[PDB]
């Protein structure tokens, strides 16, 4: 079961939803959280873009920008349409890393490349419930879409609604430390909500955890246009609540890590974890 081929963004969509940079204004919920260290983060985020949406964003990307794709689920482009293979709760490629995902989704995309009558499901929010019937259209990976615009591309496989695995955190902190000072990171997921806001928060913490309170970092990433990583339901979605609490606990632990290891040094994430009681 590879999941239902579903529309993420139609080709006609332009700027993706939940687009924000670290220079965006903060919308107050509560007082406006601290802005200290926010503007200099060289980070932005969004939901999944169409091909046209990526080209539009590129107009305002600095030189040496990187698209950081956080989606563990298989996805790509059919023409300008952003499409993905959706399993229940969007848990595609469960437990798999980016190397496995890239090859799996390459095969899924190859199977719809330049073929007629490809049925693409649409949720109600994206013009559904009637599906689109498309093709022949070129099917490409987001990796190639980014390369075609001269943009960097990094894939990190994070499950929807879920914290990143320790191995992903380790890889990301090492990646962050390898970056020259001019490199900009644009994170995205499907919705630009949980996963995107999680990683913008990690970038925030890697620079600012020694000087800025945990609550301010969480609140300001929400206020910039991200989702609220401190929110849970009233109990109506227990499985989702358990993931949200697991993710918030991880973020508290990462904040402690980033205070003791500014910028991810001297210890990496998993080495730091080995010193716990």
């Amino acid at each position: 079961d590879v999941g239902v081929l579903t529309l993420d963004a139609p080709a006609a969509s332009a700027l993706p939803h939940r687009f924000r940079t670290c220079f965006f204004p903060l919308t107050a919920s509560a007082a406006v959280p601290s802005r200290e260290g926010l503007n200099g983060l060289r980070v932005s985020g969004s939901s999944q873009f169409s091909l046209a949406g990526l080209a539009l964003m590129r107009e305002q990307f600095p030189p040496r920008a990187v698209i950081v794709d956080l989606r563990r689920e298989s996805h790509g482009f059919l023409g300008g349409n952003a499409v993905s293979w959706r399993l229940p709760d969007n848990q595609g490629n469960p437990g798999r890393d980016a190397a496995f995902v890239a090859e799996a989704e390459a095969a899924l995309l190859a199977a719809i490349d330049e073929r007629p009558d490809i049925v693409v499901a649409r949720e109600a929010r994206r013009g559904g419930p009637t599906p689109l019937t498309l093709g022949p259209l070129p099917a490409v990976s987001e990796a190639q879409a980014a390369a075609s615009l001269g943009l960097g591309y990094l894939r990190l496989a994070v499950s929807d609604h879920t914290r990143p695995d320790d191995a992903v955190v380790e890889r990301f902190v090492r990646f962050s430390r390898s970056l020259p000072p001019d490199v900009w990171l644009h994170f995205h997921s499907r919705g630009g909500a949980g996963r995107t806001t999680t990683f913008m928060t990690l970038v925030d913490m890697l620079r600012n955890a020694p000087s800025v309170a945990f609550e301010d970092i969480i609140a300001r990433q929400k206020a910039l246009g991200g989702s609220d990583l401190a929110k849970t339901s009233d109990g109506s979605a227990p499985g989702r609540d358990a993931l949200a609490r697991q993710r918030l606990e991880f973020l508290r632990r990462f904040y402690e890590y980033a205070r003791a290891n500014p910028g991810g040094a001297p210890l990496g994430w998993t080495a730091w974890l080995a010193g716990g009681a």
Copy 2:
């Protein structure tokens, strides 16, 4: 059998060998070939770089530059060292496409990541014949190395000493057509010779085949610092000669394609071949 882990470039290497851009001077072999349309190609090439070499090249890369990695063989970086898995005649991952290769080499790199006493073979040209023992060091794909510098990355799996498969040519022509006018392509292979020079020639033909003779394009990509794609042995290496002849025939056919379809349009490579080449 995944091949012998071998050094491509030591971490201390800086500018890679056979580095050139389409703005470089031409060295005559024969008259200096025509330069018509050469400087505007938005293309460069090199041999395999170290991590330091990539950072150095980035100092002179334009905005929106793409590293186009032509290597079908598995390779990556062990610390700053560029390393690869060499089968006989460097025919790693035979017949496989970039998606397969990326996953295969990711596993090979994971197995040497941050581990001690990794033995890396060295050819005489690359500091050998004594091997190099390295580690613990971070092992990364070139895709990640490129991303860490904010550079684009495209992988096209081409066998050493060989023309690109039709599917690779089709993918590349479509890629070329998709580029906005500011995107710069930096090709590389292992040596910056056959495969890199082939693809710089393809880019040249896509822009200039209607106005510039085939012989001038081949000669100028050599004169810029590439290898000679019109060269063969005297019969002393017949298998390599057969590959070189097959590649040259492909380049003549692509030249005709690019004359009939300037810039890769209206017809693509496979569609042009399917229609009988006009």
